[PDB]
Amino acid sequence: TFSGGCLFDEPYSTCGYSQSEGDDFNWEQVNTLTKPTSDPWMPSGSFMLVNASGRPEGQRAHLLLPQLKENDTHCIDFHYFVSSKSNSPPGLLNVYVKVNNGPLGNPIWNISGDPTRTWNRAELAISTFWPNFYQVIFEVITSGHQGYLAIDEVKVLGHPCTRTPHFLRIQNVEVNAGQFATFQCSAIGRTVAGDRLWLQGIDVRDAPLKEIKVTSSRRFIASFNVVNTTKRDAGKYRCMIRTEGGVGISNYAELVVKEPPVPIAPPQLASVGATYLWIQLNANSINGDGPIVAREVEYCTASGSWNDRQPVDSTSYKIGHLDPDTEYEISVLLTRPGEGGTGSPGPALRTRTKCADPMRGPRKLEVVEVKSRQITIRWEPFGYNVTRCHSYNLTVHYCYQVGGQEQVREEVSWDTENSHPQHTITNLSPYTNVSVKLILMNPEGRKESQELIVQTDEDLPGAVPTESIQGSTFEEKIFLQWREPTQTYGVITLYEITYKAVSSFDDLSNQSGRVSKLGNETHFLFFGLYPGTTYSFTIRASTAKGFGPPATNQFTTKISAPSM
Amino acid sequence: TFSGGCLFDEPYSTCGYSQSEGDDFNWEQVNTLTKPTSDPWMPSGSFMLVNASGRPEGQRAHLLLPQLKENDTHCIDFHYFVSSKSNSPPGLLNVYVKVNNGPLGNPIWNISGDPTRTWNRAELAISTFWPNFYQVIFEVITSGHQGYLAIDEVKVLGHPCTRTPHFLRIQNVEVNAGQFATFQCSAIGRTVAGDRLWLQGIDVRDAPLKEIKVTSSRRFIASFNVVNTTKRDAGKYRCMIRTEGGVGISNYAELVVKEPPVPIAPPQLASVGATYLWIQLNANSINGDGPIVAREVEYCTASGSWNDRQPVDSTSYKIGHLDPDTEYEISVLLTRPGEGGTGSPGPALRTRTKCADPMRGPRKLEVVEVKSRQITIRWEPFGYNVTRCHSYNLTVHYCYQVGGQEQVREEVSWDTENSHPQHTITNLSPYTNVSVKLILMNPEGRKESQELIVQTDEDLPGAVPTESIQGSTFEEKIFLQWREPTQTYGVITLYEITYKAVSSFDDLSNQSGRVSKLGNETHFLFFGLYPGTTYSFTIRASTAKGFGPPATNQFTTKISAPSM
Ligand SMILES: *[C@@H]1O[C@H](CO)[C@@H](O)[C@H](O)[C@H]1NC(C)=O
Ligand SMILES: *[C@@H]1O[C@H](CO)[C@@H](O)[C@H](O)[C@H]1NC(C)=O
Ligand SMILES: *[C@@H]1O[C@H](CO)[C@@H](O)[C@H](O)[C@H]1NC(C)=O
Ligand SMILES: *[C@@H]1O[C@H](CO)[C@@H](O)[C@H](O)[C@H]1NC(C)=O
Ligand SMILES: *[C@@H]1O[C@H](CO)[C@@H](O)[C@H](O)[C@H]1NC(C)=O
Ligand SMILES: *[C@@H]1O[C@H](CO)[C@@H](O)[C@H](O)[C@H]1NC(C)=O
Ligand SMILES: *[C@@H]1O[C@H](CO)[C@@H](O)[C@H](O)[C@H]1NC(C)=O
Ligand SMILES: *[C@@H]1O[C@H](CO)[C@@H](O)[C@H](O)[C@H]1NC(C)=O
Ligand SMILES: *[C@@H]1O[C@H](CO)[C@@H](O)[C@H](O)[C@H]1NC(C)=O
Ligand SMILES: *[C@@H]1O[C@H](CO)[C@@H](O)[C@H](O)[C@H]1NC(C)=O
Ligand SMILES: *[C@@H]1O[C@H](CO)[C@@H](O)[C@H](O)[C@H]1NC(C)=O
Ligand SMILES: *[C@@H]1O[C@H](CO)[C@@H](O)[C@H](O)[C@H]1NC(C)=O
Ligand SMILES: *[C@@H]1O[C@H](CO)[C@@H](O)[C@H](O)[C@H]1NC(C)=O
Ligand SMILES: *[C@@H]1O[C@H](CO)[C@@H](O)[C@H](O)[C@H]1NC(C)=O
Ligand code: NA
Ligand code: NA
Ligand code: NA
Ligand code: NA
């Protein structure tokens, strides 16, 4: 029950055939073995003719089979004939296959077609089935030249073609723009060396055969790639094979070229930390299309040093484990399905992280040298890892008494860039306990070092006050007494004290000496002197580091009636 | 503002600490430099004690930090002390990290812990942040033996640990059952040769380190694989690293082990064709779980010869381009996302395709030899490709007349398995046009061969009827006449006819002969005979293949008065 053919003995109306009356001219129907003819370039029998004779170039005539709507594999075959006259093509012969009353589409078969005064078989293996349907259409386009073109036994047959393979139903293909798409055409039949293979589309560039894989004499697989795809490539396509005796075509199959996602606006900033960064992935309003199946966050330091791509599950996302006083650049990457699925990174939020209050105060706080009214200290350097902030300051903090009131000073060392840093404190009182500490400050907090204590070196004292130097005289002895120096600058270890006989009730007064005494007693009983004489005494106090300056005074011994 | 620590000078209540009063006994709080002690195995200072002395094995005591809920990277560190006595462990020391007031979980740190009469630092790098929270818990389990176990300066610090790395937040992992899952732990710190690494879970088997990749002194990536996964593997997991001076732990991250899809019931059969098969993919009611992201149909011939896996887009799906009288087996494959995503093929619909009516009638229908009443014919063999049905029959159909009525016979050749097949028709009439044709039949339709015509060979005729053999006599001559044989079986080419003088009015009658005559005239004028004599005549008709049988008769010449 598999008709649609036509031997053209009956009128072609009978076969379901018709003329596209919106073109230029009509095909003729002829029977030479009822009405014979002298014409040399006309063959015998019953056929449909196009007489291109007297016709200008470009003029075309269309002749349509009825619309077929089959289930089983079938094969259409027909015979054609061309003749001049001159010997030039009277016109081209095209065959189109319009499917589901859609566009005419590109032609699937054609001869150029030079004269041969001989008939020729040609079959078509169209793979378009119920519930879809298709219309075969024969078109002649006139060359301007003066010959004949004929069709003679169209035959629709409910079995596979014999000289052309058949394509198995090809399904739609989705692809991400930029990447290439591939059409895998399964076929059932033999293909040979001469056979031409390609992928045909309506209103889009046809693609060529990429490769062919011959599984057997009975079946093969031809692949076709549409390359560097855009939305302008998206459309309908079908596989093609032309063999010496026919042409096979697949169904149409749609290429959907979808554009990978990119987020419209950058990620909003939720809150800032020292070592973290809560952000808001916007990435809902997007610039491409398709189902987002994966969302990554990508961040890099402004210098470059570090960068990390990391998948994010929620809208609110925390970037933890960052560096404190650091400039960060964050973009969001979206991903749709398939090979080029991810696509570009969105606008970048640029933000920087707070400072952390410092790890700790500096360390190895040593004394280098101590002096009378000054000392030098030192410590181990530290850097970004202790400071946790590119802006900071280091401060030296000392404390002491002299002797009544306290004094509490602070300085600022500039040894930010220093191997074996130092700081020399000055303007101190001797023999005083300086309590030193290094306080490290940044805008968030502070950390003081270990507290060191350094006793300032001793020094030479002041002189014994001259008001204090009081003496008690006797014939033959003098008791000298004094008070400690108003300001000692150390422990008084010794008093050196000299005496000279200066005058007398007169001889030769060779009666001098020096004497010494522990610091803890401020007196000296002068032993065995001359009476009536006056002695000068000069005292000098002393400290571990030697003698201070001299007070001095004179006293004169008693006299008495001589005896006897 | 980063507290949670405890020096244990203040009561531990002050630090946020407490006792899990639903266990066996409580930790003690001690101050040896207010209340001194003779006990040799007790150190100086302010700490929390567990006195395992007098305690049986198994008995445990718990001591909880408060719950921390931080944002910035921090590091917990504490000091511990163990002493016997004997020299055996008075008990184990465990540390747990309970997160979001969930289960206690497995312990993250522990010493066995043999005596050393010395303190020991230990830090923890816990990566669980606001809005989540966690509780550190110190547990001692008594060994049965008689020693002391102590904790002395817990310190929460708002900076990274110094001797342990930190894990970056690990996200949840989905995996298909059967395949393995992988936990990629990003870390920030240094890891060394001695460090122990693993993946810890609550209520599931822990997995071991698969590999470690050291990007720098500052950061590395440790991978952990859960192998041959089932739903019994699905749960919460976190990364672990133990270093000589501490332990770092990631957040928990969920393993979701989903089961690949399999369809519950087979594909329903929609309609059957010769070269096709509309089916209904049920594959909606399914046996696994997850979003079906791809559906394939798979079919194979019952023999095996061909099988094809092909993606299907709709519920209703047509399998085209099949072989006719062929048993087919069809199962549906479903696919969910990820590495082991497809999973098994469903129940199989088993069905077979109809027959196609045959391609054509057989060919090269030749004559081999023709005979009088029989002939032999032959043709080219064909097979499944012409028959399109494993059940069929070939039939020989002939037609002829003899001579009045028609005869129309049909036979059935059994040369199903034959190189150069033959069939000898019999019981035919000679010199008759037999019109032969081979009709090939199967249950769907038929196709007759080309119609051949064979003229059956000639044969010897019948005799001339003896009623017809009439003669007219004269003195000296006889005119013999007859009719053609009632049934000639060919064209009569000759009549042979003999005559003998048999008697007379009496000598020596040597007066015989034979004569011949074209078939198209049935008479003979016998030339110059004797009068009064009687002649016997015997006629024999002839055909291309020779003489048929004889009719025969006698006539006698006239007499007359003699003259003169
Ligand atoms: C084609 O048209 C020309 C008129 O220009 C006519 O002479 C010729 O016979 C036609 N050929 C046909 C219809 O056979
Ligand atoms: C082809 O098969 C379809 C689906 O069963 C059926 O409806 C149709 O009538 C069949 N034959 C024709 C008319 O193409
Ligand atoms: C067939 O037509 C195409 C254009 O549709 C042309 O490229 C090709 O040369 C033609 N082939 C022939 C006539 O063999
Ligand atoms: C980080 O801190 C340390 C001090 O412990 C310093 O030696 C180093 O230069 C800093 N940077 C690194 C990790 O190289
Ligand atoms: C030192 O400089 C830091 C800036 O990094 C500032 O925070 C701090 O207050 C300064 N010290 C003082 C109190 O002068
Ligand atoms: C300095 O420190 C020492 C040691 O603490 C102490 O004995 C002494 O009294 C302090 N003052 C002076 C003036 O040395
Ligand atoms: C003072 O101290 C010294 C000890 O260095 C002792 O010899 C002497 O007796 C003391 N004298 C006084 C005045 O206390
Ligand atoms: C531990 O308990 C025992 C009692 O069996 C006691 O003698 C010992 O002093 C305790 N140790 C402590 C609390 O220091
Ligand atoms: C940590 O950050 C969160 C989110 O901004 C904030 O609500 C919380 O108060 C912060 N600090 C604390 C109390 O952990
Ligand atoms: C720590 O505890 C685990 C069990 O949780 C045990 O396998 C391991 O030996 C212990 N390690 C020590 C005490 O170093
Ligand atoms: C198919 O049919 C042909 C007849 O054209 C026959 O030669 C062959 O044995 C059959 N099977 C195949 C394709 O091998
Ligand atoms: C021959 O056998 C086929 C079975 O394949 C059957 O369809 C056909 O009708 C038979 N021929 C007749 C009419 O006896
Ligand atoms: C047989 O066929 C031939 C050729 O068609 C014909 O001329 C003849 O009359 C037919 N009949 C006999 C009896 O030969
Ligand atoms: C019969 O036919 C032959 C030709 O073969 C011719 O010689 C003869 O004259 C014919 N005679 C009759 C009786 O028609
Ligand atoms: Na015809
Ligand atoms: Na037209
Ligand atoms: Na303490
Ligand atoms: Na308890």
PDB file of C-alpha atoms and ligand atoms in Angstrom, chain A residues 431-433 455, ligand 6:
ATOM      1  CA  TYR A 431      71.945  53.959  90.832  1.00  0.00           C
ATOM      2  CA  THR A 432      68.212  53.786  90.053  1.00  0.00           C
ATOM      3  CA  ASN A 433      66.105  50.824  88.924  1.00  0.00           C
ATOM      4  CA  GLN A 455      69.910  49.191  87.667  1.00  0.00           C
TER       5      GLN A 455
HETATM    6  C1  LIG C   6      66.817  48.500  93.019  1.00  0.00           C
HETATM    7  O1  LIG C   6      66.441  47.134  92.910  1.00  0.00           O
HETATM    8  C2  LIG C   6      66.969  46.292  93.922  1.00  0.00           C
HETATM    9  C3  LIG C   6      66.544  44.853  93.644  1.00  0.00           C
HETATM   10  O2  LIG C   6      65.135  44.772  93.614  1.00  0.00           O
HETATM   11  C4  LIG C   6      66.527  46.770  95.315  1.00  0.00           C
HETATM   12  O3  LIG C   6      67.035  45.952  96.350  1.00  0.00           O
HETATM   13  C5  LIG C   6      66.952  48.217  95.537  1.00  0.00           C
HETATM   14  O4  LIG C   6      66.481  48.680  96.787  1.00  0.00           O
HETATM   15  C6  LIG C   6      66.391  49.054  94.388  1.00  0.00           C
HETATM   16  N1  LIG C   6      66.701  50.479  94.525  1.00  0.00           N
HETATM   17  C7  LIG C   6      67.938  50.993  94.490  1.00  0.00           C
HETATM   18  C8  LIG C   6      68.047  52.452  94.851  1.00  0.00           C
HETATM   19  O5  LIG C   6      68.947  50.347  94.183  1.00  0.00           O
END
